[PDB]
């Protein structure tokens, strides 16, 4: 227990649900947050640190280059552009695209990551697990870029999960959600939920820690008011994940 | 009955650049929208300077907020801009604040900018 996954060393603000615009998060209250950047250095997608050498993200983010040398990672950050001194910049060595759906990808760090109180992995869930309807979760990221104040600061929003059965009703996603994905948001009195980046994390607290339940989808991850967002349902891929880390 | 402004591109031209302030408020807790009749702020520098100060804008907004309280409305205390807040030119280009929360707007050309989005607020007491 000298820094276990899912346990932040800075209690998260835990922005209430439906708060317009979301909230700027407490710095380092989401130590698994990753910032996927290009060689030149520009931030462009999110990631979740799952172990000292592995970052989970969205395949779509890798569309431009297959060369893992074209990607860098930023760990422990809060500011999007101007970076702090403690920030950890690790280059990527290999890329692992999930075979069955090609939606998420695994990033292996050229060198491990010094686990500190600002850089702690998130906990993966149990294989094939299904987060119950209404469970309160959080999305975090630098996804929103239209605000004039606070531009660049890591933000968070609270989203309760929507049972796919409901999520797929005509009024909502109308049958577009596979069992391999989950939904989160509000169906009433809700607001924009676009703070997370594509590939960004969607974690849900359980008993005493934060478990990574979904990866913010490319495009459909950013939902408008009263429309739920769509995340890749991580539990449906833990096995594959565990295996990749275990063999590389 | 509150009628919002027109899009910058539709408004009549001016000869003294100004900031159109059309924001709504969000009651912390209930998250309900509070409509405020839009107002204007004059600019002169780079009249409020062309280098605006967050705390200033919020102060203008707070003043306007209590100037429109009708018999049935209650008083609200401006808390801060929601991450929602955005200042744009007539084309939709966004201007960003610095670390000290200061936004700096072009001196020339002369034009108007728009400040929209929400302002977090709580009922005064």
């Amino acid at each position: 227990p000298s820094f276990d996954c899912g346990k932040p060393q800075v209690e998260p603000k835990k922005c209430p649900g439906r708060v317009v615009g979301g909230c700027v998060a407490h710095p380092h209250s989401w130590p698994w947050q990753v910032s996927l950047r290009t060689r030149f250095g520009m931030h462009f997608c999110g990631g979740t640190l799952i172990s000292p050498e592995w970052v989970l993200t969205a395949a779509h983010c890798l569309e431009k280059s297959p060369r893992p040398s074209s990607y860098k990672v930023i760990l422990g950050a809060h500011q999007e552009v101007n970076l702090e001194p403690h920030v950890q910049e690790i280059e990527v060595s290999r890329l692992f695209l999930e075979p069955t759906r090609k939606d998420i990808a695994l990033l292996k760090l050229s060198s491990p990551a010094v686990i500190t109180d600002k850089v702690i992995p998130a906990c993966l869930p149990s294989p094939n697990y299904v987060v119950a309807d209404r469970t309160e979760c959080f999305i975090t990221g630098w996804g929103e870029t239209q605000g004039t104040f606070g531009a660049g600061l890591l933000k968070e929003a609270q989203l309760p999960v929507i049972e796919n059965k409901v999520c797929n009703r005509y009024e909502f996603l109308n049958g577009r959600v596979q069992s391999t994905e989950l939904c989160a948001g509000h169906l009433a009195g809700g607001t924009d939920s676009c703070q997370g980046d594509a590939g960004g994390p969607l974690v849900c607290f359980e008993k005493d820690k934060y478990i990574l339940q979904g990866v913010t989808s490319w495009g459909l991850g950013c939902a408008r008011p009263n429309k739920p967002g769509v995340y890749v349902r991580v539990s449906r891929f833990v096995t594959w994940i565990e295996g990749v880390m275990r063999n590389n | 009955m509150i009628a919002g402004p027109e899009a910058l591109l539709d408004r009549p031209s001016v000869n003294n650049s100004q900031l159109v302030v059309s924001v709504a408020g969000t009651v912390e807790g209930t998250n309900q929208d509070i409509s405020l009749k839009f107002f204007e702020i004059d600019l002169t520098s780079r009249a409020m300077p062309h280098k605006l100060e967050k705390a200033d804008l919020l102060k203008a907004i707070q003043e306007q907020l209590i100037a429109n309280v009708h018999s049935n409305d209650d008083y609200f205390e401006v808390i801060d801009f929601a991450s929602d807040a955005t200042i744009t030119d007539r084309n939709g280009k966004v201007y960003f604040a610095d670390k000290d929360g200061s936004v700096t707007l072009p001196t020339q050309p002369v034009q108007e900018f728009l400040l929209s989005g929400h302002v977090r607020v709580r009922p005064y007491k």
Side-chain angles (χ1 to χ4, degrees):
Chain A
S2 192
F3 285 150
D4 318 326
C5 58
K7 284 174 163 291
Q9 288 314 294
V10 177
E11 193 174 339
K13 182 178 305 185
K14 309 193 73 177
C15 198
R18 305 189 184 74
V19 151
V20 182
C23 293
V24 170
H26 283 169
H28 319 301
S29 64
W30 304 115
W32 41 86
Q33 180 67 60
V34 176
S35 173
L36 223 195
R37 303 158 95 126
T38 81
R39 65 176 300 191
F40 222 35
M42 174 200 94
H43 166 77
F44 71 93
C45 263
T48 310
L49 185 65
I50 70 172
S51 99
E53 298 177 82
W54 302 91
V55 169
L56 186 61
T57 189
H60 215 104
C61 296
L62 308 180
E63 238 170 40
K64 289 181 162 91
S65 179
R67 300 177 297 303
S69 60
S70 308
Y71 301 100
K72 191 216 316 307
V73 164
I74 277 57
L75 305 181
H78 190 266
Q79 230 299 310
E80 194 188 322
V81 168
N82 309 286
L83 289 181
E84 292 186 24
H86 85 288
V87 157
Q88 284 186 64
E89 265 192 55
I90 307 175
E91 183 179 310
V92 175
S93 45
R94 258 290 255 215
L95 303 170
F96 297 88
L97 162 65
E98 189 281 318
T100 81
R101 294 276 191 296
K102 285 171 169 187
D103 283 338
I104 63 188
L106 264 169
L107 302 183
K108 189 197 179 191
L109 305 174
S110 67
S111 43
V114 182
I115 299 313
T116 79
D117 36 49
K118 289 173 175 42
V119 179
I120 307 171
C123 302
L124 293 174
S126 32
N128 310 298
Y129 176 70
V130 179
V131 179
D133 182 70
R134 277 157 158 154
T135 306
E136 296 309 309
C137 305
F138 282 91
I139 52 163
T140 65
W142 289 281
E144 246 317 311
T145 57
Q146 278 197 310
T148 284
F149 304 84
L153 314 179
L154 177 70
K155 277 172 294 183
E156 54 165 87
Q158 172 158 177
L159 304 185
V161 330
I162 310 289
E163 189 190 71
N164 286 28
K165 189 217 300 182
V166 180
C167 185
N168 280 306
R169 287 165 42 181
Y170 180 75
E171 317 105 81
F172 309 129
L173 291 182
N174 202 11
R176 299 168 239 167
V177 181
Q178 332 259 241
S179 63
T180 43
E181 298 133 347
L182 61 78
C183 310
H186 291 272
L187 304 173
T191 177
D192 279 337
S193 57
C194 296
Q195 295 79 10
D197 303 276
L202 182 153
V203 295
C204 315
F205 184 79
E206 192 246 48
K207 247 104 299 182
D208 46 42
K209 61 173 161 294
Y210 284 105
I211 301 176
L212 190 186
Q213 294 302 2
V215 168
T216 303
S217 161
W218 172 286
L220 284 179
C222 161
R224 308 180 330 192
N226 304 307
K227 266 300 202 292
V230 173
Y231 311 71
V232 172
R233 173 167 245 134
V234 190
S235 71
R236 285 299 299 283
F237 303 90
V238 183
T239 289
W240 171 72
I241 300 168
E242 313 261 53
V244 166
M245 300 197 295
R246 189 176 56 218
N247 301 302
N248 298 277
Chain B
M1 176 181 121
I2 315 185
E6 293 183 16
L8 295 309
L9 65 151
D10 271 18
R11 305 188 102 229
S13 47
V14 193
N15 20 267
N16 262 156
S17 290
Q18 53 177 32
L19 180 76
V20 182
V21 176
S22 197
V23 300
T26 328
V27 187
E28 103 182 317
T30 63
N31 292 311
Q32 53 196 128
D33 262 15
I34 293 177
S35 300
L36 170 61
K37 176 61 185 54
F38 82 96
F39 64 97
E40 302 139 308
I41 295 185
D42 239 288
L43 311 172
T44 44
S45 188
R46 195 185 83 283
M48 211 131 262
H50 282 225
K51 185 170 174 302
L52 310 169
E53 299 299 312
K54 192 188 182 188
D56 284 334
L57 293 172
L58 289 182
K59 207 170 176 169
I61 296 177
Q62 168 79 87
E63 183 173 32
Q64 227 76 203
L65 217 55
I66 50 182
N68 304 164
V69 180
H70 293 54
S71 296
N72 286 315
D73 316 4
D74 359 57
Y75 295 129
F76 285 106
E77 163 180 37
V78 172
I79 293 165
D80 183 12
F81 285 115
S83 310
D84 194 316
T86 307
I87 295 189
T88 57
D89 58 27
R90 113 181 195 107
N91 296 314
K93 159 174 186 55
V94 175
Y95 293 76
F96 301 86
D98 285 331
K99 293 208 170 188
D100 70 307
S102 304
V103 192
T104 279
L105 313 168
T107 16
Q108 41 261 44
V110 169
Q111 69 185 310
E112 33 189 40
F113 301 104
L114 168 76
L115 165 61
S116 25
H118 299 76
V119 176
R120 303 175 35 214
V121 300
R122 71 164 66 65
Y124 252 132
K125 199 54 249 290

mmCIF file of all heavy atoms in Angstrom, chain A residues 41-76:
data_model
loop_
_atom_site.group_PDB
_atom_site.id
_atom_site.type_symbol
_atom_site.label_atom_id
_atom_site.label_comp_id
_atom_site.label_asym_id
_atom_site.label_seq_id
_atom_site.Cartn_x
_atom_site.Cartn_y
_atom_site.Cartn_z
ATOM 1 N N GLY A 41 5.030 18.421 -29.448
ATOM 2 C CA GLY A 41 4.602 18.752 -28.095
ATOM 3 C C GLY A 41 3.158 19.157 -27.833
ATOM 4 O O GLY A 41 2.771 19.359 -26.674
ATOM 5 N N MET A 42 2.352 19.272 -28.883
ATOM 6 C CA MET A 42 0.969 19.684 -28.705
ATOM 7 C C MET A 42 0.088 18.587 -28.085
ATOM 8 O O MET A 42 0.174 17.412 -28.463
ATOM 9 C CB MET A 42 0.392 20.123 -30.054
ATOM 10 C CG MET A 42 -1.104 20.450 -30.015
ATOM 11 S SD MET A 42 -1.955 20.414 -31.646
ATOM 12 C CE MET A 42 -2.610 18.738 -31.709
ATOM 13 N N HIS A 43 -0.743 18.981 -27.121
ATOM 14 C CA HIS A 43 -1.679 18.072 -26.458
ATOM 15 C C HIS A 43 -2.812 17.771 -27.426
ATOM 16 O O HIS A 43 -3.334 18.682 -28.048
ATOM 17 C CB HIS A 43 -2.271 18.741 -25.231
ATOM 18 C CG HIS A 43 -3.466 18.037 -24.677
ATOM 19 N ND1 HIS A 43 -3.374 16.883 -23.929
ATOM 20 C CD2 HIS A 43 -4.785 18.335 -24.744
ATOM 21 C CE1 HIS A 43 -4.582 16.504 -23.554
ATOM 22 N NE2 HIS A 43 -5.457 17.368 -24.038
ATOM 23 N N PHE A 44 -3.217 16.515 -27.549
ATOM 24 C CA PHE A 44 -4.291 16.217 -28.481
ATOM 25 C C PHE A 44 -5.301 15.126 -28.101
ATOM 26 O O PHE A 44 -6.333 15.000 -28.756
ATOM 27 C CB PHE A 44 -3.708 15.880 -29.848
ATOM 28 C CG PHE A 44 -3.018 14.561 -29.897
ATOM 29 C CD1 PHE A 44 -3.710 13.420 -30.296
ATOM 30 C CD2 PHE A 44 -1.682 14.445 -29.511
ATOM 31 C CE1 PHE A 44 -3.082 12.182 -30.307
ATOM 32 C CE2 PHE A 44 -1.042 13.212 -29.519
ATOM 33 C CZ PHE A 44 -1.744 12.074 -29.918
ATOM 34 N N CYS A 45 -5.020 14.346 -27.062
ATOM 35 C CA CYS A 45 -5.917 13.282 -26.632
ATOM 36 C C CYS A 45 -5.641 12.967 -25.182
ATOM 37 O O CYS A 45 -4.650 13.414 -24.630
ATOM 38 C CB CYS A 45 -5.700 12.024 -27.476
ATOM 39 S SG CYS A 45 -6.839 11.766 -28.889
ATOM 40 N N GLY A 46 -6.521 12.194 -24.561
ATOM 41 C CA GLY A 46 -6.331 11.841 -23.165
ATOM 42 C C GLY A 46 -5.904 10.398 -23.010
ATOM 43 O O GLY A 46 -5.891 9.625 -23.962
ATOM 44 N N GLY A 47 -5.541 10.033 -21.797
ATOM 45 C CA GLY A 47 -5.129 8.674 -21.538
ATOM 46 C C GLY A 47 -5.283 8.406 -20.062
ATOM 47 O O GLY A 47 -5.477 9.339 -19.279
ATOM 48 N N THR A 48 -5.234 7.136 -19.676
ATOM 49 C CA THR A 48 -5.330 6.779 -18.268
ATOM 50 C C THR A 48 -4.157 5.871 -17.994
ATOM 51 O O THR A 48 -3.939 4.919 -18.719
ATOM 52 C CB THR A 48 -6.612 6.010 -17.931
ATOM 53 O OG1 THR A 48 -7.754 6.687 -18.462
ATOM 54 C CG2 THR A 48 -6.763 5.910 -16.440
ATOM 55 N N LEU A 49 -3.382 6.191 -16.971
ATOM 56 C CA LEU A 49 -2.237 5.376 -16.599
ATOM 57 C C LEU A 49 -2.802 4.167 -15.897
ATOM 58 O O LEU A 49 -3.490 4.321 -14.883
ATOM 59 C CB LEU A 49 -1.363 6.134 -15.625
ATOM 60 C CG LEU A 49 -0.070 5.418 -15.263
ATOM 61 C CD1 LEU A 49 0.835 5.294 -16.490
ATOM 62 C CD2 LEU A 49 0.620 6.219 -14.180
ATOM 63 N N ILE A 50 -2.522 2.973 -16.412
ATOM 64 C CA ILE A 50 -3.064 1.763 -15.791
ATOM 65 C C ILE A 50 -2.044 0.956 -14.964
ATOM 66 O O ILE A 50 -2.435 0.121 -14.145
ATOM 67 C CB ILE A 50 -3.731 0.849 -16.849
ATOM 68 C CG1 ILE A 50 -2.675 0.222 -17.752
ATOM 69 C CG2 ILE A 50 -4.673 1.658 -17.713
ATOM 70 C CD1 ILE A 50 -3.237 -0.829 -18.684
ATOM 71 N N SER A 51 -0.756 1.237 -15.196
ATOM 72 C CA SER A 51 0.399 0.637 -14.508
ATOM 73 C C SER A 51 1.615 1.488 -14.936
ATOM 74 O O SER A 51 1.587 2.112 -15.999
ATOM 75 C CB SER A 51 0.608 -0.823 -14.936
ATOM 76 O OG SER A 51 1.627 -0.923 -15.926
ATOM 77 N N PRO A 52 2.708 1.498 -14.137
ATOM 78 C CA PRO A 52 3.913 2.286 -14.444
ATOM 79 C C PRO A 52 4.355 2.363 -15.899
ATOM 80 O O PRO A 52 4.976 3.345 -16.298
ATOM 81 C CB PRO A 52 4.973 1.639 -13.570
ATOM 82 C CG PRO A 52 4.220 1.245 -12.403
ATOM 83 C CD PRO A 52 2.972 0.619 -12.985
ATOM 84 N N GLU A 53 4.044 1.338 -16.691
ATOM 85 C CA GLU A 53 4.464 1.320 -18.101
ATOM 86 C C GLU A 53 3.350 1.300 -19.127
ATOM 87 O O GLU A 53 3.624 1.247 -20.320
ATOM 88 C CB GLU A 53 5.327 0.091 -18.385
ATOM 89 C CG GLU A 53 6.625 -0.013 -17.608
ATOM 90 C CD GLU A 53 7.354 -1.305 -17.919
ATOM 91 O OE1 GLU A 53 8.072 -1.379 -18.951
ATOM 92 O OE2 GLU A 53 7.187 -2.261 -17.135
ATOM 93 N N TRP A 54 2.101 1.331 -18.682
ATOM 94 C CA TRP A 54 0.994 1.238 -19.619
ATOM 95 C C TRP A 54 -0.084 2.289 -19.546
ATOM 96 O O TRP A 54 -0.663 2.539 -18.486
ATOM 97 C CB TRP A 54 0.335 -0.126 -19.475
ATOM 98 C CG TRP A 54 1.273 -1.252 -19.707
ATOM 99 C CD1 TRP A 54 2.034 -1.902 -18.780
ATOM 100 C CD2 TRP A 54 1.557 -1.856 -20.959
ATOM 101 N NE1 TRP A 54 2.776 -2.885 -19.382
ATOM 102 C CE2 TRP A 54 2.500 -2.879 -20.724
ATOM 103 C CE3 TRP A 54 1.099 -1.638 -22.266
ATOM 104 C CZ2 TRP A 54 3.001 -3.682 -21.749
ATOM 105 C CZ3 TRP A 54 1.593 -2.435 -23.291
ATOM 106 C CH2 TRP A 54 2.536 -3.449 -23.023
ATOM 107 N N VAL A 55 -0.370 2.890 -20.691
ATOM 108 C CA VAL A 55 -1.415 3.900 -20.757
ATOM 109 C C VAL A 55 -2.497 3.414 -21.683
ATOM 110 O O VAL A 55 -2.210 2.943 -22.777
ATOM 111 C CB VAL A 55 -0.895 5.243 -21.289
ATOM 112 C CG1 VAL A 55 -2.067 6.163 -21.589
ATOM 113 C CG2 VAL A 55 0.014 5.876 -20.267
ATOM 114 N N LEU A 56 -3.736 3.522 -21.225
ATOM 115 C CA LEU A 56 -4.872 3.098 -22.024
ATOM 116 C C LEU A 56 -5.490 4.312 -22.686
ATOM 117 O O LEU A 56 -5.724 5.330 -22.022
ATOM 118 C CB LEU A 56 -5.923 2.424 -21.155
ATOM 119 C CG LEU A 56 -7.046 1.841 -22.005
ATOM 120 C CD1 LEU A 56 -6.458 0.799 -22.922
ATOM 121 C CD2 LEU A 56 -8.108 1.241 -21.144
ATOM 122 N N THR A 57 -5.772 4.208 -23.984
ATOM 123 C CA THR A 57 -6.355 5.336 -24.708
ATOM 124 C C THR A 57 -7.337 4.888 -25.784
ATOM 125 O O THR A 57 -7.763 3.746 -25.800
ATOM 126 C CB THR A 57 -5.235 6.208 -25.341
ATOM 127 O OG1 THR A 57 -5.795 7.415 -25.867
ATOM 128 C CG2 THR A 57 -4.540 5.458 -26.447
ATOM 129 N N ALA A 58 -7.699 5.808 -26.669
ATOM 130 C CA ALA A 58 -8.627 5.524 -27.761
ATOM 131 C C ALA A 58 -7.842 5.362 -29.060
ATOM 132 O O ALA A 58 -7.031 6.208 -29.419
ATOM 133 C CB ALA A 58 -9.642 6.646 -27.893
ATOM 134 N N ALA A 59 -8.104 4.266 -29.756
ATOM 135 C CA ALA A 59 -7.399 3.952 -30.976
ATOM 136 C C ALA A 59 -7.390 5.112 -31.917
ATOM 137 O O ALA A 59 -6.350 5.469 -32.452
ATOM 138 C CB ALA A 59 -8.024 2.752 -31.647
ATOM 139 N N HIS A 60 -8.555 5.714 -32.096
ATOM 140 C CA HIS A 60 -8.715 6.837 -32.998
ATOM 141 C C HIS A 60 -7.639 7.894 -32.887
ATOM 142 O O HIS A 60 -7.273 8.503 -33.882
ATOM 143 C CB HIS A 60 -10.059 7.498 -32.794
ATOM 144 C CG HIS A 60 -10.645 8.025 -34.063
ATOM 145 N ND1 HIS A 60 -11.677 7.392 -34.722
ATOM 146 C CD2 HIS A 60 -10.307 9.092 -34.823
ATOM 147 C CE1 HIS A 60 -11.954 8.050 -35.834
ATOM 148 N NE2 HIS A 60 -11.139 9.087 -35.919
ATOM 149 N N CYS A 61 -7.155 8.135 -31.677
ATOM 150 C CA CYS A 61 -6.086 9.102 -31.427
ATOM 151 C C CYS A 61 -4.789 8.735 -32.162
ATOM 152 O O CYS A 61 -3.963 9.589 -32.460
ATOM 153 C CB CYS A 61 -5.788 9.156 -29.933
ATOM 154 S SG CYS A 61 -7.163 9.762 -28.903
ATOM 155 N N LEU A 62 -4.620 7.457 -32.453
ATOM 156 C CA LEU A 62 -3.419 6.985 -33.113
ATOM 157 C C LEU A 62 -3.499 7.003 -34.641
ATOM 158 O O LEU A 62 -2.545 6.660 -35.336
ATOM 159 C CB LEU A 62 -3.152 5.565 -32.624
ATOM 160 C CG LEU A 62 -3.130 5.405 -31.104
ATOM 161 C CD1 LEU A 62 -2.859 3.953 -30.745
ATOM 162 C CD2 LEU A 62 -2.059 6.324 -30.516
ATOM 163 N N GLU A 63 -4.642 7.425 -35.155
ATOM 164 C CA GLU A 63 -4.890 7.442 -36.591
ATOM 165 C C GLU A 63 -3.775 8.007 -37.453
ATOM 166 O O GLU A 63 -3.438 7.425 -38.484
ATOM 167 C CB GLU A 63 -6.212 8.174 -36.892
ATOM 168 C CG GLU A 63 -7.225 7.296 -37.664
ATOM 169 C CD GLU A 63 -8.608 7.911 -37.755
ATOM 170 O OE1 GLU A 63 -8.694 9.149 -37.961
ATOM 171 O OE2 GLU A 63 -9.604 7.151 -37.623
ATOM 172 N N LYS A 64 -3.187 9.116 -37.017
ATOM 173 C CA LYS A 64 -2.132 9.762 -37.787
ATOM 174 C C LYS A 64 -0.818 8.991 -37.967
ATOM 175 O O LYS A 64 -0.334 8.862 -39.089
ATOM 176 C CB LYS A 64 -1.872 11.165 -37.225
ATOM 177 C CG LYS A 64 -3.013 12.172 -37.521
ATOM 178 C CD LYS A 64 -2.666 13.556 -36.960
ATOM 179 C CE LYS A 64 -3.506 14.663 -37.585
ATOM 180 N NZ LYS A 64 -4.776 14.993 -36.865
ATOM 181 N N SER A 65 -0.233 8.455 -36.903
ATOM 182 C CA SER A 65 1.023 7.722 -37.047
ATOM 183 C C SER A 65 1.083 6.409 -36.282
ATOM 184 O O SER A 65 0.649 6.320 -35.130
ATOM 185 C CB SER A 65 2.202 8.601 -36.629
ATOM 186 O OG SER A 65 3.423 7.891 -36.745
ATOM 187 N N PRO A 66 1.614 5.359 -36.923
ATOM 188 C CA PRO A 66 1.735 4.039 -36.307
ATOM 189 C C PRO A 66 3.055 3.929 -35.544
ATOM 190 O O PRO A 66 3.253 3.035 -34.711
ATOM 191 C CB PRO A 66 1.643 3.103 -37.507
ATOM 192 C CG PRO A 66 2.371 3.844 -38.522
ATOM 193 C CD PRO A 66 1.881 5.274 -38.366
ATOM 194 N N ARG A 67 3.943 4.870 -35.829
ATOM 195 C CA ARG A 67 5.230 4.900 -35.182
ATOM 196 C C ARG A 67 5.061 5.371 -33.745
ATOM 197 O O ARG A 67 4.705 6.524 -33.497
ATOM 198 C CB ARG A 67 6.167 5.856 -35.934
ATOM 199 C CG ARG A 67 6.439 5.488 -37.396
ATOM 200 C CD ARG A 67 7.312 6.517 -38.094
ATOM 201 N NE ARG A 67 6.673 7.826 -38.159
ATOM 202 C CZ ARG A 67 5.487 8.063 -38.715
ATOM 203 N NH1 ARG A 67 4.783 7.080 -39.270
ATOM 204 N NH2 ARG A 67 4.995 9.293 -38.716
ATOM 205 N N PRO A 68 5.311 4.488 -32.776
ATOM 206 C CA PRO A 68 5.184 4.853 -31.359
ATOM 207 C C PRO A 68 6.164 5.942 -30.958
ATOM 208 O O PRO A 68 6.088 6.493 -29.863
ATOM 209 C CB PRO A 68 5.454 3.539 -30.627
ATOM 210 C CG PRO A 68 6.265 2.784 -31.582
ATOM 211 C CD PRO A 68 5.653 3.071 -32.919
ATOM 212 N N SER A 69 7.085 6.249 -31.859
ATOM 213 C CA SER A 69 8.075 7.281 -31.614
ATOM 214 C C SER A 69 7.453 8.644 -31.903
ATOM 215 O O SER A 69 8.045 9.673 -31.628
ATOM 216 C CB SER A 69 9.276 7.059 -32.526
ATOM 217 O OG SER A 69 8.882 7.109 -33.890
ATOM 218 N N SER A 70 6.248 8.649 -32.447
ATOM 219 C CA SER A 70 5.603 9.906 -32.775
ATOM 220 C C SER A 70 4.729 10.376 -31.636
ATOM 221 O O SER A 70 4.056 11.405 -31.740
ATOM 222 C CB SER A 70 4.764 9.729 -34.026
ATOM 223 O OG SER A 70 5.557 9.159 -35.047
ATOM 224 N N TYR A 71 4.755 9.625 -30.541
ATOM 225 C CA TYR A 71 3.954 9.959 -29.374
ATOM 226 C C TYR A 71 4.777 10.140 -28.107
ATOM 227 O O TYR A 71 5.771 9.446 -27.903
ATOM 228 C CB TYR A 71 2.934 8.860 -29.143
ATOM 229 C CG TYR A 71 2.030 8.651 -30.317
ATOM 230 C CD1 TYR A 71 2.258 7.604 -31.213
ATOM 231 C CD2 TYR A 71 0.967 9.517 -30.562
ATOM 232 C CE1 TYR A 71 1.446 7.422 -32.337
ATOM 233 C CE2 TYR A 71 0.148 9.343 -31.679
ATOM 234 C CZ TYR A 71 0.396 8.291 -32.561
ATOM 235 O OH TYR A 71 -0.410 8.103 -33.656
ATOM 236 N N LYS A 72 4.344 11.066 -27.254
ATOM 237 C CA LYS A 72 4.994 11.368 -25.978
ATOM 238 C C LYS A 72 3.835 11.354 -24.994
ATOM 239 O O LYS A 72 2.685 11.459 -25.407
ATOM 240 C CB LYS A 72 5.597 12.773 -26.018
ATOM 241 C CG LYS A 72 6.522 13.129 -24.879
ATOM 242 C CD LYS A 72 6.368 14.593 -24.488
ATOM 243 C CE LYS A 72 6.303 15.536 -25.687
ATOM 244 N NZ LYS A 72 7.442 15.371 -26.623
ATOM 245 N N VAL A 73 4.117 11.245 -23.705
ATOM 246 C CA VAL A 73 3.056 11.236 -22.720
ATOM 247 C C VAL A 73 3.340 12.227 -21.598
ATOM 248 O O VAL A 73 4.492 12.413 -21.235
ATOM 249 C CB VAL A 73 2.932 9.839 -22.158
ATOM 250 C CG1 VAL A 73 2.127 9.829 -20.867
ATOM 251 C CG2 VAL A 73 2.311 8.954 -23.211
ATOM 252 N N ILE A 74 2.318 12.903 -21.079
ATOM 253 C CA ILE A 74 2.551 13.820 -19.973
ATOM 254 C C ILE A 74 1.800 13.337 -18.737
ATOM 255 O O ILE A 74 0.578 13.187 -18.745
ATOM 256 C CB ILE A 74 2.141 15.266 -20.309
ATOM 257 C CG1 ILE A 74 3.274 15.965 -21.070
ATOM 258 C CG2 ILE A 74 1.885 16.054 -19.029
ATOM 259 C CD1 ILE A 74 3.707 15.278 -22.341
ATOM 260 N N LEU A 75 2.555 13.080 -17.673
ATOM 261 C CA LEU A 75 1.980 12.571 -16.436
ATOM 262 C C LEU A 75 2.143 13.545 -15.296
ATOM 263 O O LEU A 75 3.129 14.257 -15.227
ATOM 264 C CB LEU A 75 2.639 11.241 -16.061
ATOM 265 C CG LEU A 75 2.591 10.157 -17.129
ATOM 266 C CD1 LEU A 75 3.253 8.897 -16.640
ATOM 267 C CD2 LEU A 75 1.145 9.883 -17.472
ATOM 268 N N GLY A 76 1.157 13.567 -14.406
ATOM 269 C CA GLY A 76 1.187 14.459 -13.256
ATOM 270 C C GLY A 76 0.830 15.922 -13.506
ATOM 271 O O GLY A 76 0.909 16.722 -12.579
#
